[PDB]
Design a binder for this molecule. Structure first.
Ligand code: HEM
Ligand SMILES: *[C@@H]1O[C@H](CO)[C@@H](O[C@@H]2O[C@H](CO)[C@@H](O[C@H]3O[C@H](CO)[C@@H](O)[C@H](O)[C@@H]3O)[C@H](O)[C@H]2NC(C)=O)[C@H](O)[C@H]1NC(C)=O
Ligand SMILES: *[C@@H]1O[C@H](CO)[C@@H](O[C@@H]2O[C@H](CO)[C@@H](O)[C@H](O)[C@H]2NC(C)=O)[C@H](O)[C@H]1NC(C)=O
Ligand SMILES: *[C@@H]1O[C@H](CO)[C@@H](O)[C@H](O)[C@H]1NC(C)=O
Ligand SMILES: *[C@@H]1O[C@H](CO)[C@@H](O)[C@H](O)[C@H]1NC(C)=O
Ligand SMILES: CC(=O)Nc1ccc(O)cc1
Ligand SMILES: [Ca+2]
Length: 595
């Protein structure tokens, strides 16, 4: 029982032992088990998968088959009855900058990516799912319910294609289906450098011995760099404006261009790497290219790790931070550093923090131009608003001065995402991220809400009155019972996000526990954790201790007025200071005298 491993996908396993740098694929991090945490391997299962047929079919596939004796409600109905809301007033988080939401997506894209299966190169089946809404194989359409407005203007469904899974790609059946994580489980800046050697290399500027990352040769941000373009067709960034004809960017991670602020954040990171390669050159003229690239890579990965664990997680978890992530004790080679399947859903809480508009601010932090504020849906895969309309400085100001959307039980996901999401190769700004999250949760064979409450050592409500007490909300509990007919069937994504927020944090107790464990594990289980003895020098470590997101902005834009604490709500000019009164990153301890 339980033979140890299917392993047709990741075959090659060769580990240079001495190495001072992480591999791109994440392999060799764990010396006892070298493939743990590498990209392109199955997501970890913290609990056995739950499928309608116990093997691969998701719940909601066969009409007559129930879950625990009940039909599961359509993803879109749960979306319409619980997730939507009209009034965008008073929905803003008075105490989290918009940078808060953005950093979450960034970290998230470093950690996991379960892309759709691909049997659609020169195919009809791409359209057979779009055109006629016929379920079968990897096509698992999100049907609209009886009273849905999209029925009137969009057809019968919203297309959806099941997520990639390991050994095969169309058929297989003996063990439960396990989805693939295409990025490294380590918080290693794989989103800047890539998780594949093919991409990692392409991203590099291999024309000179400076260990720099390739930059855009066709457009400049007033002297500063832009991410190179991804010359590939069909490009969705060109699709949203065929006049501007501006391609999507090429980053270590596929999704970089999905929305303009992520693209922005990716730009800052790329610049910081290069800035780091240049200062290291000055101090170490002898270091070759590779060394420069790697030493810069290594520094940027630490940066991402510090900001995430010192600044970000404490304000996501609040009071629960300590219960799950106690002070670092060092590298424990016994810990599973893989990202769990459920984490990829639990981290989607960030979806309720996305606001309906985005702004561009000038040097006085006032409306940049006559259309400074734009609706969120006009920015999906929009790279021209950056290239042909002000570079990233105006947007980075918005990220600092604007607020994230506070999650709210009566106002969960803004319609910009819930009704107007754009998906590549599909042609309308008419998709629903909430519905997709739900369908996806079933596609991954996720256990119900209570299995996870049980997993986290929390009560498992079984009645209306039961759920009200946990959700601390009668009306929401009723709507959920009416739809699910048992809390045992509530999809973990929505059940987890419906819980009230723990003191000082921005997620409920279930999620705090799920997020808490995962982050504790990617930290304790990482051999290259920045604070782990032997990775950096004692002196380099005191220099790193000084990074701030503020500093990153000062060093990589033309902004000189920034707050001290980037993730909290900050107003200009009061909460802002001059970049000069801000700790820089002293790179002296990287100088290497050996003569
Ligand atoms: C405007 C901002 C955002 C947009 C437009 C967006 C859109 C999307 C879309 C289209 C997907 C894939 C759906 C699927 O195929 O299952 C996705 C997935 C996801 N999002 Fe977002 N998202 C945004 C922000 C965020 C934020 C702020 C966070 C975290 C705090 C986040 C966390 C995730 C996670 C974990 C996934 C699952 C990734 C995987 O496949 O492993 N997202 N998002
Ligand atoms: C698609 O992208 C087009 C290319 O940028 C964009 O057109 C550009 O955007 C506006 C639209 O008129 C113009 O900017 C405005 O502001 C400047 C201030 O300097 C003034 O010249 C005018 O008031 C002007 O309207 C750009 O001039 C314009 N450029 C071109 C070549 O058309 C479109 O608006 C975008 N279309 C969509 C559907 O997104
Ligand atoms: C790779 O780096 C090289 C060397 O820095 C780049 O070539 C230079 O680009 C500058 C602009 O910064 C131009 O003035 C010169 O043509 C080059 N200068 C030097 C000193 O070499 C090149 O653009 C980079 N290539 C890519 C694809 O990013
Ligand atoms: C805002 O959040 C921060 C934590 O990021 C905390 O120090 C503070 O108590 C909050 N401020 C207000 C005014 O609510
Ligand atoms: C190392 O990890 C294992 C599994 O998580 C745990 O049982 C053990 O207590 C850990 N030891 C230390 C010193 O962290
Ligand atoms: C680019 C793309 O495939 N879409 C996309 C997927 C996930 C996500 O979090 C943001 C965007
Ligand atoms: Ca990673």
């Amino acid at each position: 029982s339980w033979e140890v491993g299917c392993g047709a996908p990741v075959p090659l396993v060769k580990c240079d032992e001495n190495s001072p740098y992480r591999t791109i694929t994440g392999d060799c991090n764990n010396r006892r088990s070298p493939a743990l945490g590498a990209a392109n391997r199955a997501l970890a299962r913290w609990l056995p998968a739950e499928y309608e047929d116990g093997l691969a079919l998701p719940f909601g596939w066969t009409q007559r088959k129930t879950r625990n004796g009940f039909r599961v409600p359509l993803a879109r109905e749960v979306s319409n009855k619980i997730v939507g809301y009209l009034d965008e007033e008073g929905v803003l988080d008075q105490n989290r900058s918009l940078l808060f939401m953005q950093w979450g997506q960034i970290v998230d894209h470093d950690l996991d990516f379960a892309p759709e299966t691909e049997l659609g190169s020169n195919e009809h089946s791409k359209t057979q799912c779009e055109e006629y809404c016929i379920q079968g194989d990897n096509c698992f359409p999100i049907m609209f319910p009886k009273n849905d407005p999209k029925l009137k203007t969009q057809g019968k469904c919203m297309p959806f294609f099941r997520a990639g899974f390991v050994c095969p790609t169309p058929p297989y059946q003996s063990l439960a289906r396990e989805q693939i994580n295409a990025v490294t489980s380590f918080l290693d800046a794989s989103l800047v450098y890539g998780s594949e050697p093919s991409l990692a290399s392409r991203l590099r500027n291999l024309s000179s011995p400076l260990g720099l990352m390739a930059v855009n040769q066709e457009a400049w941000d007033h002297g500063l760099a832009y991410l190179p373009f991804n010359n590939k067709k069909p490009s969705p960034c060109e699709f949203i404006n065929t006049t501007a004809r501006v391609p999507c960017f090429l980053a270590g991670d596929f999704r970089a261009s999905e929305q303009i602020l992520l693209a922005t954040a990716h730009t800052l990171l790329l610049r910081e790497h290069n800035r780091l390669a240049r200062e290291l050159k000055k101090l170490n003229p002898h270091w070759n290219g590779e060394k420069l690239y790697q030493e810069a890579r290594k520094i940027l990965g630490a940066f991402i790790q510090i900001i995430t664990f010192r600044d970000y997680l404490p304000i996501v978890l609040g009071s629960e931070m300590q219960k799950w992530i106690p002070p670092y004790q060092g590298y424990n080679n016994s810990v599973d550093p893989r990202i769990s399947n459920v984490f990829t859903f639990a981290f989607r809480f960030g979806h309720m923090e996305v606001p309906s508009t985005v702004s561009r601010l000038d040097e006085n932090y006032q409306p940049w131009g006559p259309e400074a504020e734009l609706p969120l849906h006009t920015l999906f895969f929009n790279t021209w608003r950056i290239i042909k309309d002000g570079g990233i400085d105006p947007l980075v100001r918005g990220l600092l001065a604007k607020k994230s959307k506070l999650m709210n039980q009566d106002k969960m996901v803004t319609s910009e995402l819930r009704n107007k999401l754009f998906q590549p190769t599909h042609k309308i700004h008419g998709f629903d991220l909430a519905a997709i999250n739900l369908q996806r949760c079933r596609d991954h064979g996720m256990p119900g809400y209570n299995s996870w409450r049980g997993f986290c050592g929390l009560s498992q409500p079984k009645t209306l009155k039961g759920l009200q007490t946990v959700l601390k909300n009668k009306i929401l509990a009723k709507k959920l019972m009416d739809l699910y007919k048992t809390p045992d069937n509530i999809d973990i994504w929505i059940g987890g996000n419906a819980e009230p927020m723990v003191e000082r944090g921005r997620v409920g107790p279930l999620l705090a526990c799920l997020l808490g464990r995962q982050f504790q594990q990617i930290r304790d289980g990482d051999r290259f954790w920045w604070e782990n003895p032997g990775v950096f020098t004692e002196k380099q470590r005191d220099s790193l201790q000084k990074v701030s997101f503020s500093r990153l902005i000062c060093d990589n834009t033309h902004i000189t007025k920034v707050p001290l604490h980037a993730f909290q709500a900050n107003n200009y000019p009061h909460d802002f200071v001059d970049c000069s009164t801000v700790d820089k990153l002293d790179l002296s301890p990287w100088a290497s005298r050996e003569n």
